[PDB]
Curated annotation (Swiss-Prot):
Belongs to the RRM CPEB family. Isoform 1 is expressed in immature oocytes, ovary, brain and heart. Isoform 2 is expressed in brain and heart. Isoform 3 and isoform 4 are expressed in brain. Expressed in breast tumors and several tumor cell lines. The keyword Transferase does not apply. It comes from the Eukaryota. This is Cytoplasmic polyadenylation element-binding protein 1. The chain holds residues 294 to 510 of 566 of the full protein. Sequence-specific RNA-binding protein that regulates mRNA cytoplasmic polyadenylation and translation initiation during oocyte maturation, early development and at postsynapse sites of neurons. Binds to the cytoplasmic polyadenylation element (CPE), an uridine-rich sequence element (consensus sequence 5'-UUUUUAU-3') within the mRNA 3'-UTR. RNA binding results in a clear conformational change analogous to the Venus fly trap mechanism. The keyword Ribonucleoprotein applies. GO terms for biological process: cellular response to amino acid stimulus; cellular response to hypoxia; cellular response to insulin stimulus; mRNA processing; negative regulation of cytoplasmic translation; regulation of mRNA 3'-end processing. One of its GO terms (molecular function) is translation factor activity, RNA binding. It is found in: Cytoplasm; Nucleus; Cytoplasm, P-body; Cytoplasmic granule. It comes from Homo sapiens (Human).
Length: 213
RNA sequence: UUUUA
């Protein structure tokens, strides 16, 4: 029970990016200080790091970092300084650069923006939400289209009334995945049995359920 | 060495 490339035909290219972006790679034991100097501008620049939720259950030499800043002009200045795939902002775009040239210089850091659009949506009719029928989901790329998560949670076992990514860590969008239903059977059976290998011929990932308590 | 409730 798996499928790929069956995502909605809807696309857009007219809007611009938001104040938040991700910065993957950085396996060189650096901290958020690496991005506070990489994106130093005369305007605002604020760091963003989840701090391992203060639990610090692990401490690998690798990790991933983030930032948020009001320079929409610098967001496009660094997305044109970085390069990999200048494709559509519908999650099809991607960029890369590097932070070393004398040690482990065989890699590049991943650079991915976010758009001015809302992070959650569903194609089904709307219904009221409750914490008793929702979940937070991970094991995914930290970023996916809400209309794609709507189709995956609407096709693999039954229908759904809300899906996508939810906003956190700051006043700007995106942070972690979420989905909500109106029946407990379609609820945990779809989001926990979505072991499928999700693909759109330019991205590959999986999804897993996690309770809020 | 690929993403924050």
């Amino acid at each position: 029970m798996t499928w790929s490339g069956q995502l909605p035909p809807r696309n857009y290219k007219n809007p611009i990016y938001s104040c938040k972006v991700f910065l993957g790679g950085v396996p060189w034991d650096i901290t958020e200080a690496g991005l506070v100097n990489t994106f130093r501008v005369f305007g605002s620049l604020s760091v963003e790091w989840p701090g391992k939720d203060g639990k610090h259950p692990r401490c690998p030499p690798k990790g991933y970092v983030y930032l948020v800043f009001e320079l929409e002009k610098s967001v496009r200045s660094l997305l044109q300084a970085c390069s990999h795939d200048p494709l559509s902002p519908d999650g099809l775009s991607e960029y890369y650069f590097k932070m070393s040239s004398r040690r482990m210089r065989c890699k590049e850091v991943q650079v991915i923006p976010w758009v001015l659009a809302d992070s959650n949506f569903v194609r089904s009719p709307s219904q009221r939400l409750d914490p008793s029928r929702t979940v937070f989901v991970g094991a995914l790329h930290g970023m996916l289209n809400a209309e794609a998560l709507a189709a995956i949670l609407n096709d693999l076992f039954g229908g759904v009334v809300y899906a996508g990514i939810d906003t956190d860590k700051h006043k700007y969008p995106i942070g972690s995945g979420r989905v909500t239903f109106n029946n407990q059977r379609s609820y945990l059976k779809a989001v926990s049995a979505a072991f499928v290998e999700i693909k759109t011929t330019k991205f590959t990932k999986k999804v897993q359920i996690d309770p809020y308590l």
